[PDB]
Design a protein around this nucleic acid. Structure first.
Lengths: 413, 16
DNA sequence: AATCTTTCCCACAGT
DNA sequence: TTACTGTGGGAAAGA
């Protein structure tokens, strides 16, 4: 028996904001597999269950009688539903998918991962899609003509080292960079000018990253950075110091620590250290580097879905999660808001704070709603005396609340 | 544009 | 034309 | 020891 969200329940939501979030972290390209090969997606796509709402939900299911196994969130992952691989989430808020691949039998140029989730008692959560992933034949000189294979300064990359069991990923934890076998970080790669100096503060530049250029790698999660590096192209076991073409997806790279005696960013098992290169005999535009000094680079992306059971458990899955891209004022006898986005349905209402607004559905990408009168927020106000800002939330008819980061502000005339 | 950023530095230790 | 991508092949270093 | 398997390099083929 589905219940509409009440204003009491909305106010309780708005003061706590204990959402359940599904985060899907993954790379932007994947190399295809030919014949009977399996070339695993790397870094492995990762599902994170973020937000205090997961613990809250678990406590609710167990109060109502469920065992630990029945309240355990479960997830399966697959590629464009063309069969899914089970992930293991027990004891952790995340799981990685380490054996996904795509066969050339699949003709798609692009695809999305599908993550299907439910609780151990088989209560449905839903299906969550990753961002678009581009199939490539293999890594490439490469031209700037194909910017999807290039790497813009200020975008995020993952970095991994292979000695398939040996694979480790650059990652930050416990206040240090390390080479993890379980998790991978996403790092901003910023271009710096050749004559910019080391420091906690530094100036970054726009443009596509080229070998030979000076870069800063900054953890997107912790904000910590490595020293200035010169990114260099790797051939088998050597750094090429004269290479200057664009860095491309899934290229092997080396990172020379600028202003050192041939020291390169290197792993020693889980440890990140610097390790001195060996100068080459007759080819002095080359240096020989440790096997732990070679890193594969790839651009990353993420999808994020946020929901909350405003009136307790529901029968239907919470997906497809509606997403608001933009709000625009709109004009008549009273003001109206045009919502643009994705996965809208006729059973959604826009709420302004704890006030449910009249809401019209046009199609999956467009809703229109009527701005409540200011007196719904401020008792007696016949006009906007002072600015009043309220949150904008989407709510389904069974009480599922979908957080947005949007607000509406009443502004004096 | 060109932008001024802040990031805590972490320098890798020399090999043992 | 000429270069670039896609497909195919196979050795390496381990189960 | 033989068989198998991702991965990485390189040749052949098609764009």
């Amino acid at each position: 028996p589905p219940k509409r969200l009440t204003r009491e329940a909305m106010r309780n939501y708005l003061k706590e904001r204990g959402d359940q979030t599904v985060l899907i972290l993954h790379a932007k390209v994947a190399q295809k597999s030919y014949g009977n090969e399996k070339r695993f997606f790397c870094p492995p796509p990762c599902v994170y269950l973020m937000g205090s709402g997961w613990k809250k939900k678990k406590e609710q299911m167990e109060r109502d009688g469920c065992s630990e196994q029945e309240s355990q969130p479960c997830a399966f992952i697959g590629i464009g539903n063309s069969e899914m691989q089970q992930l293991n989430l027990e004891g952790k808020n995340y799981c990685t998918a380490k054996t996904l691949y795509i066969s050339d039998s699949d003709k798609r140029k692009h695809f999305m991962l599908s993550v299907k989730m439910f609780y151990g008692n088989s209560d449905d959560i839903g299906v969550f899609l990753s961002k678009r992933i581009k199939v490539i034949s293999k890594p490439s000189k490469q031209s700037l003509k194909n910017a999807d294979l290039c790497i813009a300064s200020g975008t995020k990359v993952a970095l991994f080292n292979r000695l398939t069991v040996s694979t480790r990923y650059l990652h930050v934890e416990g206040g240090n960079f390390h080479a993890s076998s379980q998790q991978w970080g996403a790092f901003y790669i910023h271009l710096l000018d050749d004559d910019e100096s080391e420091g906690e503060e530094f100036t970054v530049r726009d443009g596509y990253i080229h070998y030979g250029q000076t870069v800063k790698l900054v953890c997107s999660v912790t904000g910590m950075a490595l020293p200035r590096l010169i990114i260099r192209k790797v051939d088998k076991q050597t750094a090429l110091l004269d290479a200057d073409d664009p860095v491309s997806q899934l290229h092997k790279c080396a990172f020379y620590l600028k202003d050192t005696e041939r020291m390169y960013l290197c792993l020693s098992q889980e440890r990140i250290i610097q390790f001195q290169a060996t100068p080459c005999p007759k080819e002095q535009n080359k240096e020989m580097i440790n096997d732990g000094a070679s890193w594969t680079i790839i651009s990353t992306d993420k999808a994020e879905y946020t929901f909350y059971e405003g009136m307790g458990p529901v029968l239907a899955p919470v997906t497809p999660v509606p997403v608001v891209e933009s709000l625009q004022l709109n004009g008549g006898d009273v003001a109206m808001l045009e919502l643009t986005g994705q996965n809208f349905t006729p059973n959604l209402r826009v709420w302004f704070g704890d006030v449910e607004a009249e809401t019209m559905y046009r199609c999956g990408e467009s809703m229109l709603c009527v701005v409540p009168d200011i007196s719904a927020f401020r008792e007696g106000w016949r006009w906007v005396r002072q600015p009043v800002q309220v949150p904008v939330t989407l709510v389904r008819n069974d009480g599922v609340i979908y957080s947005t980061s949007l607000t509406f502000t009443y502004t004096p005339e | 544009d060109a932008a001024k950023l802040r990031a805590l530095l972490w320098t890798p230790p020399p090999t043992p």
